[model samples]
Target: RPKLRVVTLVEHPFVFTRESDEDGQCPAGQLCLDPGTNDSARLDALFAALVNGSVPRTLRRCCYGYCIDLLERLAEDLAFDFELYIVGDGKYGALRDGRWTGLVGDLLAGRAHMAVTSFSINSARSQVVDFTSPFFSTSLGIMVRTRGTELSGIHDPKLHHPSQGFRFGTVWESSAEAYIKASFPEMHAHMRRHSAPTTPHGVAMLTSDPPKLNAFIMDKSLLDYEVSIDADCKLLTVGKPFAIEGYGIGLPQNSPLTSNLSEFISRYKSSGFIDLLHDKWY
Candidate 1:
């Protein structure tokens, strides 16, 4: 049985954390904020403590999400152990300063053996790490603040043009952002003035009064869930999703565990467990 150090990002309903207990909670007794919340400062402190190895077990947070279930089930089937940690940098995975950062960085640096979350599988990533069989399929989507009337022809990209007064943004350095850069040059250049730092924050921007963003773009699966939980119920994911992709388990190149984990994912999909997770979480 292998004990793996795993790296992942916090994405709502996909990967998130909560404090282990109140006994060792933040002095404010907040268990710290849920990682999915829009508060970046608190999230930074949590990851920093984890990276510094200064937090006791009780002070640490427990991981839970669709991906967490996969990790748990895989552990049971393979009889292995995994310790999960958040990527302190928070960008999913970006190549910067001539080095990989976030999930890919941790894996390449041997800080972890596996990576997961709402991680996308693209050729850029495949060049560096092997991805398991896809567990979920998704695409980039457009989300906007709920309107008094459904805008006609929203599915038409023309209606979303920056010149059309449909301002939007996506997570900084995210896969969805890259997709925008490659496929929607006009929108990409415009997003520079309106970029969001994270999905939750992107949602916040859309939901905020006199909203900073008229709309936000990101992975449809994420927007689907985010638009569902708005306290104000003031957001909506509109139009057809584009630039389709799948979510896969990420592993180091030629990992010893790749085949086994990928097999598990294939089995999970065939067995309806993948749908069961979607039913439970989505």
Candidate 2:
């Protein structure tokens, strides 16, 4: 069988890298190692234990095979050989002014056989590419670093009014950005501080030394996953989620594979494997 190329983003727990020859079963409550690089400073013996005592090295998590578990099932059931294409530097796929970009671009260009990640299914996106039945449901929310210092009665601008003086970090080319533009016009009235290419980059900006952003805003599912895995970052969600959405696997427009994929995803949902994935990750 010809190898199918699958494209995905590098959001932690959803679609990120893991060390080679590593075991999937990490110690209970052990910090999840960020797939691509060593970003977590909160390390312990458990990491060394996971890698069997070798000084932990960095590598890809075989893309979709290890990043998003559902994609693994998709390839296997189809009896197809596959290659994983991980888009680095925070691109979560977008299209603007009639041109496709990121993972969507890869699919449109016929460079990939499929796109999978926590990609949201929306009208704008649906116009360009077909989506399999949504595999995950989520919503947009805000993330901020939990300050260690004592707070005065005076309110913090970061929580109450993020756009005033604070730098707001968001995925530049994403549906989240679209939501910000349409729903939060007040943000446009303020100075734009930073625009990250991906969710992880935005979160990094939020948690960086002398923090680059006052708040990181994006999908709660992604932010919660990151915070759950990395406690040293002191990241927490602010308030409640602002918008509801569902995540769907991306397929090329008019592709013959969509129906088959959707059917398989339905079967997985009914068989409770999807729930198992959620229980493991979320």
Give the Cα lDDT of each candidate.
Answer: 0.75, 0.65
Model 2 quality (TM-score): 0.74
- Per-residue lDDT of model 1, residues 1-282, tens digit only: 677767778898987777666554434212322243223455446656765846665436666878888888998998898666677678777677998776777677766688878999887888998899899999788787766323332245543454555566788878887677776677678786787778998888876767788777789899889878878887887776578888888888999999998888899999999999999988
Q: Which stretches of candidate 2 lie over 4 Å from their true place?
A: 19-61, 64-67, 88-90, 147-164, 186-192
Q: What's the CA error at residue 124 for candidate 1, in Å?
A: 1.0
Q: For model 2, where is the 10-residue window of minimal lDDT?
A: 35-44
Residue 178 lDDT (model 1): 68
For residues 198-217, write the lDDT of model 2, one tens digit per residue. Answer: 67778888778788886777
Task: Quote the lDDT for 64 in model 2.
Answer: 30
lDDT of 2 at 39: 24
Q: What's the lDDT of the predicted structure labeled candidate 2?
A: 0.65
Top candidate, metric lDDT: 1
